[PDB]
């Protein structure tokens, strides 16, 4: 998602499903309902 | 900011946006018409 060479246009923005995996957010910022430093 | 990823010396045309519409979108609703 982050290192893709081209990004979709905003009018046709891309949506991707994340499923069945370990989300490591240290590899990565306004968060609503949550704090990024706790996202792990 | 993606300047040294997307900036073009001529004007990029790969990123479009809807500048006119009937009514404002509903949350998480896409319009590719």
């Amino acid at each position: 998602v982050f290192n893709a060479t081209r990004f979709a246009s905003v009018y046709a923005w891309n949506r991707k499903r994340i499923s069945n995996c370990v989300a490591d957010y240290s590899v990565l910022f306004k968060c609503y309902g949550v704090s990024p430093t706790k996202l792990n | 900011n993606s300047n040294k990823l997307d900036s073009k010396v001529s004007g990029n045309y790969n990123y479009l946006y809807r500048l006119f519409r009937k009514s404002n979108l509903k949350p998480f609703e896409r319009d590719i018409s």
């Binding site: 060479t5 | 300047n3 073009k8």
Partner: peptide, 29 residues
């Protein structure tokens, strides 16, 4: 990934090598 590259990607070839997707990457070409 042939489609996501320039030989532009959208021809602005048969999507179905420059570092960047097309010319608009005129800092990493």
């Amino acid at each position: 990934t042939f489609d996501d590259y320039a030989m532009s990607w959208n021809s602005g070839r048969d999507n179905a090598k420059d570092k960047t997707y097309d010319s608009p990457g005129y800092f990493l070409n």
